[PDB]
């Protein structure tokens, strides 16, 4: 699995801040917009993009506060991410798109799709955010951890002061062992502890056990939309998975319209790090029939 990031930087100024993005591929078709989550960046898509770039433009932003994007002193609520990503999409001039989304990038992608359904020609997703109605429905191995993250004292200690999301959660949620070179790519945006705010706010925004109520309602709304939308969907899943275990992937194959599921083999949360070549090749193969 490749460890390099051979993509030239592109920047756009949005809402007073610079956002970095990958932009490769032809300009005369429907671009594929790749949205990472917590605590990652466009680096997560590095081995997937090369499968798609031959046929389609690939745009992969670093969310505000993350990657090579600027790091204003925000609360980094989901709503902040929504504002910045909405502005990003317009600034690069995207009209119709295909989404490829994961984790908080999936909450952003599904929320944008619900609001702009005519502009979304397909959605490839994996390990995506839907409501977790009770703590029992959160994976047991991660329950204590995320309960502690969702506090103003211990959670800030662990995530901001000690870098637990980068040094702990990230490698624990890839089956194969991340190398030190890969870890240094993930560490780079967050070398200064104070810049770790988004990494703490994100788990505090997850729609778990009814809290926070605004996120639960928003995520329920996009999931209602997704369940009724005829848009083509491609869902990757792994064993044992984290947010989307095998039996839940199978349920989604039945309960989402026009959905194809792809078993990637071993995987936890960051499926892109366990089997990028199958994820990329399957996205590439699935794109042509979306055109018409």
Swiss-Prot record:
GO biological process, one term: response to toxic substance
Record-linked SUPFAM superfamilies: alpha/beta-Hydrolases
Functional description taken from the UniProt entry: Catalyzes hydrolytic cleavage of carbon-halogen bonds in halogenated aliphatic compounds, leading to the formation of the corresponding primary alcohols, halide ions and protons. Expresses halogenase activity against 1-chloroalkanes of chain length C3 to C10, and also shows a very weak activity with 1,2-dichloroethane.
Record InterPro entries: AB_hydrolase_1, AB_hydrolase_fold, AB_hydrolase_sf, Epox_hydrolase-like, Haloalkane_dehalogenase_2
Keywords: Detoxification, Hydrolase, Plasmid
Lineage: Bacteria, Bacillati, Actinomycetota, Actinomycetes, Mycobacteriales
Induction section of the entry: By 1-haloalkanes.
Descriptive protein name: Haloalkane dehalogenase
Self-association state and partner proteins as the record states: Monomer.
Family assignment from sequence similarity: Belongs to the haloalkane dehalogenase family. Type 2 subfamily.
Organism: Rhodococcus rhodochrous
């Amino acid at each position: 699995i490749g460890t390099g990031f051979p993509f030239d930087p592109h920047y756009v100024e949005v809402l007073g801040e610079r956002m970095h993005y990958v932009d490769v591929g032809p300009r005369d078709g429907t671009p594929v917009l790749f949205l990472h989550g917590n605590p990652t960046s466009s680096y997560l898509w590095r081995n997937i993009i090369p499968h798609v770039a031959p046929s389609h433009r690939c745009i992969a932003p670093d969310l505000i506060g993350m990657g090579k994007s600027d790091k204003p002193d925000l609360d980094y609520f989901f709503d902040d991410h929504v504002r910045y990503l909405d502005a990003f999409i317009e600034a690069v001039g995207l009209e119709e798109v295909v989404l490829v989304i994961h984790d908080w990038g999936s909450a952003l992608g599904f929320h944008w799709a619900k609001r702009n359904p005519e502009r979304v020609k397909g959605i490839a997703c994996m390990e995506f955010i839907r409501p977790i109605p009770t703590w029992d429905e959160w994976p047991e191995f991660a329950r204590e951890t995320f309960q502690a993250f969702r506090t103003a004292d211990v959670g800030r200690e662990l995530i901001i002061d000690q870098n637990a999301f980068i040094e702990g959660v990230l490698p624990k949620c890839v089956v194969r062992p991340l190398t030190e070179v890969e870890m240094d790519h993930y560490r780079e945006p967050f070398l200064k502890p104070v810049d770790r705010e988004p990494l703490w706010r994100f788990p505090n925004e997850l729609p778990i056990a009814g809290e926070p109520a605004n996120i639960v309602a928003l995520v329920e709304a996009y999931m209602n939309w997704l369940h009724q939308s005829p848009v083509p969907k491609l869902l990757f899943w792994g064993t044992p998975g984290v947010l989307i275990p095998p039996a839940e992937a199978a349920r989604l194959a039945e309960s989402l319209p026009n959905c194809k599921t792809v078993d990637i083999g071993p995987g936890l949360h960051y499926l892109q790090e366990d089997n990028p070549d199958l994820i990329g090749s399957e996205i590439a193969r699935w794109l042509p029939a979306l055109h018409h």
